[PDB]
Amino acid sequence: MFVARSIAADHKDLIHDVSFDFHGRRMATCSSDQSVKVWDKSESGDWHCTASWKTHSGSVWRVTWAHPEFGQVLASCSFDRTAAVWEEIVSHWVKRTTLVDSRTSVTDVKFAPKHMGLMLATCSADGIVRIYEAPDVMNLSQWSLQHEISCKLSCSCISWNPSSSRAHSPMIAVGSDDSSPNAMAKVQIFEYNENTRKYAKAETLMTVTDPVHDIAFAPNLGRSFHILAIATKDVRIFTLKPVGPTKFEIHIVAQFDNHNSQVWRVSWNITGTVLASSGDDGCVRLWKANYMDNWKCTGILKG
Amino acid sequence: KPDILWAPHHVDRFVVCDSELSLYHVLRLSEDSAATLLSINSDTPYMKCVAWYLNYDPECLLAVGQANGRVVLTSLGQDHNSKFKDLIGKEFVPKHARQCNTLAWNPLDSNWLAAGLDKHRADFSVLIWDICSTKPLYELGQNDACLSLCWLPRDQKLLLAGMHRNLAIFDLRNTSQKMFVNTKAVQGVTVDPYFHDRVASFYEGQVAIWDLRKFEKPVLTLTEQPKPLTKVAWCPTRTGLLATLTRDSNIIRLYDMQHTTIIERSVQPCDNYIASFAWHPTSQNRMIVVTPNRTMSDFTVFERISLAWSPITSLMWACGRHLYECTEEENDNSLEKDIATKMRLRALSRYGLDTEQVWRNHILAGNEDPQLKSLWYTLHFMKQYTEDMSLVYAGIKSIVKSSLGMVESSRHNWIQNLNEERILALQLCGWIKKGTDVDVGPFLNSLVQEGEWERAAAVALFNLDIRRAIQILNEGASSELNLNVVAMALSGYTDEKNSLWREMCSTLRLQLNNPYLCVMFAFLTSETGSYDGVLYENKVAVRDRVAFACKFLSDTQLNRYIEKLTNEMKEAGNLEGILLTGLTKDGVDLMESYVDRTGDVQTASYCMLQGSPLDVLKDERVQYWIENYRNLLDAWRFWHKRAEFDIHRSKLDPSSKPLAQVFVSCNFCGKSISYSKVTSCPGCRKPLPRCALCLINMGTPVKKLAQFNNWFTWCHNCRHGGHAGHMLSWFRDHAECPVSACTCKCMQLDT
Numbered sequence A: 001m002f003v004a005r006s007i008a009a010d011h012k013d014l015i016h017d018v019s020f021d022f023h024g025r026r027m028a029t030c031s032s033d034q035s036v037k038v039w040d041k042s043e044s045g046d047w048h049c050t051a052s053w054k055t056h057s058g059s060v061w062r063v064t065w066a067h068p069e070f071g072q073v074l075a076s077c078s079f080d081r082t083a084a085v086w087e088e089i090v091s092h093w094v095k096r097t098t099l100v101d102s103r104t105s106v107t108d109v110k111f112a113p114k115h116m117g118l119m120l121a122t123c124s125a126d127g128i129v130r131i132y133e134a135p136d137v138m139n140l141s142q143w144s145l146q147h148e149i150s151c152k153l154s155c156s157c158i159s160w161n162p163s164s165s166r167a168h169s170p171m172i173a174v175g176s177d178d179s180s181p182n183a184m185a186k187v188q189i190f191e192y193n194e195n196t197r198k199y200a201k202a203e204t205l206m207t208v209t210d211p212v213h214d215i216a217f218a219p220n221l222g223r224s225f226h227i228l229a230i231a232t233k234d235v236r237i238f239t240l241k242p243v244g245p246t247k248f249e250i251h252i253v254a255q256f257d258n259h260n261s262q263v264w265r266v267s268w269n270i271t272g273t274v275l276a277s278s279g280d281d282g283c284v285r286l287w288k289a290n291y292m293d294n295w296k297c298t299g300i301l302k303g
Numbered sequence B: 001k002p003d004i005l006w007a008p009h010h011v012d013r014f015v016v017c018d019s020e021l022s023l024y025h026v027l028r029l030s031e032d033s034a035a036t037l038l039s040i041n042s043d044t045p046y047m048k049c050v051a052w053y054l055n056y057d058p059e060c061l062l063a064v065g066q067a068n069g070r071v072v073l074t075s076l077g078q079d080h081n082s083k084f085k086d087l088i089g090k091e092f093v094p095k096h097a098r099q100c101n102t103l104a105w106n107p108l109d110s111n112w113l114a115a116g117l118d119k120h121r122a123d124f125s126v127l128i129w130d131i132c133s134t135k136p137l138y139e140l141g142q143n144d145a146c147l148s149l150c151w152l153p154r155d156q157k158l159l160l161a162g163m164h165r166n167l168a169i170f171d172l173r174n175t176s177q178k179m180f181v182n183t184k185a186v187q188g189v190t191v192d193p194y195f196h197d198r199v200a201s202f203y204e205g206q207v208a209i210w211d212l213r214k215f216e217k218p219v220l221t222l223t224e225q226p227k228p229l230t231k232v233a234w235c236p237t238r239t240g241l242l243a244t245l246t247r248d249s250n251i252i253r254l255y256d257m258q259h260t261t262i263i264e265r266s267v268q269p270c271d272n273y274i275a276s277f278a279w280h281p282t283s284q285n286r287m288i289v290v291t292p293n294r295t296m297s298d299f300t301v302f303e304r305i306s307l308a309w310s311p312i313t314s315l316m317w318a319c320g321r322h323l324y325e326c327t328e329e330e331n332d333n334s335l336e337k338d339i340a341t342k343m344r345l346r347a348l349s350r351y352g353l354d355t356e357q358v359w360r361n362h363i364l365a366g367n368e369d370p371q372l373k374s375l376w377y378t379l380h381f382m383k384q385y386t387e388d389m390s391l392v393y394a395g396i397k398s399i400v401k402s403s404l405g406m407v408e409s410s411r412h413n414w415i416q417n418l419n420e421e422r423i424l425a426l427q428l429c430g431w432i433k434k435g436t437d438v439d440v441g442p443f444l445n446s447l448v449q450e451g452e453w454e455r456a457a458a459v460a461l462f463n464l465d466i467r468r469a470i471q472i473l474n475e476g477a478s479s480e481l482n483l484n485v486v487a488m489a490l491s492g493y494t495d496e497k498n499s500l501w502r503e504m505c506s507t508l509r510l511q512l513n514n515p516y517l518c519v520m521f522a523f524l525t526s527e528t529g530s531y532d533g534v535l536y537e538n539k540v541a542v543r544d545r546v547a548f549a550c551k552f553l554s555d556t557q558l559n560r561y562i563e564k565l566t567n568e569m570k571e572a573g574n575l576e577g578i579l580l581t582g583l584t585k586d587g588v589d590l591m592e593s594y595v596d597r598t599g600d601v602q603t604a605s606y607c608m609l610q611g612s613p614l615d616v617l618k619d620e621r622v623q624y625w626i627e628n629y630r631n632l633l634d635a636w637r638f639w640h641k642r643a644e645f646d647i648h649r650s651k652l653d654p655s656s657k658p659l660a661q662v663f664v665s666c667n668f669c670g671k672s673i674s675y676s677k678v679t680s681c682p683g684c685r686k687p688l689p690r691c692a693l694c695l696i697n698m699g700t701p702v703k704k705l706a707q708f709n710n711w712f713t714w715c716h717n718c719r720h721g722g723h724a725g726h727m728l729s730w731f732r733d734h735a736e737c738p739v740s741a742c743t744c745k746c747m748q749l750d751t
């Protein structure tokens, strides 16, 4: 049902990460020479360039956007133990802050859902997950550190819980990529406690006992549960149902093997019904649900 | 160990060493790739180590060492114009009986290739022998066995060798001057073209990496593998890639040395074991491998892929240096589009915003979904009885719950005599027209004209009209067949005892395909009192079964059936149940199950707003759906549609308050000037602020009476105001605040 096309965009190096904005008119890409580019669309449909600048000391893994009610804000995380925040002044992006609390390489950075303010969580390779806030939305040079979480493993990916209902407390999930020859669980979920004002472990997926390269949540849209997606040697989909931290009834609904390799990335769409996956065979596959609530492949695209 | 060597100056011609020398030029390598052989030479017995000539001339010329020790440069191509055939087939006998281990032509010189023999006692191993166009020109390496040797890619006077248990480096100027550093790996010594000062070596299941500048200890140590390594090399096309292969393995091990953590990866070329592999000198990210079944496939080592979605439901991904997009893009006119596209198109068609005739939304929806016709027809029927006439939106199960008085009938003497509580039910079902009408004639006459006869047959029979249905099932039963034959049996009926007709009529029923005649036969083959066959059938619309129940069951039997059906409807999520649940608490569970099933918030938002009571609109689950729909409309940049929805939602539901914004306050009171000169403050009667262009006080009365050109307008950064028309005219040709000694570009702060 899907058809592929090439996009006219000149790059000189290899791309590490791609990201979009809320409306889908800008994008940011980071390359091998430590450069970030911001691409703008047009009425005709072509893409043009607007900025280009070298950022960090070491290699740059990630770049992410922010909600437009806060301005034009970008966040990047790199190998030299820092994460940075960029803002647009009109057009030359400037630096605002540099988070240096880490002692090893930062692997992932993510902005928080809107209704909690302007918040940002990073994660490192020593087993620490940290959370920052900005109490003034018109002063992005002043940030604060609020929580620390010790995971006793090597973090490799994080994801927030998009749900904004009044009955869901804030949630976060952390994966691990350690290859230690043992049988420890490699995905745990942390939940906020409104009474003690701390974060506490709530569940631990004990069936995932293999290396994990990516996790992702899916938008609520008013459902009764949560949908989670994992990226290990196979693609799996879990569900959590609500029933001291709350209790869940974790099920499983999907376990696919059609890559014969290690899948690297998983990403959902705005409604939360279609899934994308990228494996080490150079193909991108899309999955959907069916009438019988059974997940079946939809399309196969070769890069 | 058969290995593959790519031709020095051919991009499609590949050489794969086997029992007999073989060259192939581009064996279906891939779906659209084929390999063709050129020539085969078999003069070399017991080959151990091989090499190819560096110079383009001669072409397809390779130098190979046998097991007895013979090195006779051999050509394979169609050569009839040899520049010098003095070496054609010519050997060069070494002074000792042994087998050559490895030989490499020097990078700088075309005709120089040094080879290292086995572990001799007191006779050399690695010597420089000139190919010209009798004895070696330089031999060294006493008390050592040349497991491997290599040439310096940049230096014209340097080389390195692998002794039995140590690594040594040799130079052209001097022979005995060397730097010896012991190591556990002495096999697979090579130089990466990008990084000259890097070295590698392999030790059984372990692999080591070294740097030439500080070659004292390994820079990195890789994980030990189960099977022993077979060949180590470097990628020629992409920088910072090194690979290792094993024995009886189908997926290779690839590792990148671009860290300064070394990213590990594996590629599976096929489903069979690969004997060896090689990297084509010019082809980008291409590997040529062979299998012992005389079948070859050129694999590739892809780069990682990144992903990103957009609200328009288009997916964009990056592969290396390029960007690709994908979407449905009107691929076809088939069914099963994702719900996001459906809702966007429905939003462009003004779906659910028809108030005069409710049932048109199901043709505005798009394709034919049987649930969205039942729901909208039910909501259409629920409004006439309300306009013509609060108890209606509670549902069937509430109107029937108060039923009192009835009589179970056991005779069949072939509607106004029954309770009004079951008359409103039948009105909602749509069997009869609204009012005191006594005949189902209109419904039957409307069903027949639409082509559907059998359903009309069942309805006409259910209210005791066998002979008045005989026509309905055999008159319109010739054009477009069977039906006469199907209804021949019909005339055998009507309440006998155990007999030949009733005995088998209830047994062969399942042979007939269509449902409605199955239920129609189900009726008359049942013990008077029980109707399980007619009341539990999933291929008959809830409408007809509910009507049948409301016409035939008893007061204390109806209420259990309604409860069971409603529980099934709620747990299922079928939208046809609104006729039973109604717009009450239970309707919220039904809608919630529907949303969990399909994720459609548009129908929920436009349905729950249709005259629901103020108790259910306050449930904190409808508001979540409405807000999610509004946010979806915002994302697609559909801003006038959102305001249109907001107007129609504030008209109906008055619980929610509109947006909260700023207001203007008087300078002398502090109170608001919102809602007796029009110009003065309503509180203190003191002048309001004056316009910066016409210098006349602002104000508005509180044909048109307050037009747009006289509204307040102010910058939110410097707080200087004026009339709307005046400021609109000023900010066309200038860009600065009209007030003197100000600096704002009061219009550029947004655009």
Ligand SMILES: [Zn+2]
Residues within 6 Å of the ligand: B666, B667, B668, B669, B670, B681, B682, B683, B684, B685, B686
């Ligand atoms: Zn006043």
Ligand SMILES: [Zn+2]
Residues within 6 Å of the ligand: B715, B716, B717, B718, B719, B720, B737, B744, B745, B746
């Ligand atoms: Zn201003």
Ligand SMILES: [Zn+2]
Residues within 6 Å of the ligand: B715, B718, B719, B720, B737, B738, B739, B742, B743, B744
């Ligand atoms: Zn001003």
Ligand SMILES: [Zn+2]
Residues within 6 Å of the ligand: B691, B692, B693, B694, B695, B696, B722, B723, B726
């Ligand atoms: Zn004015």
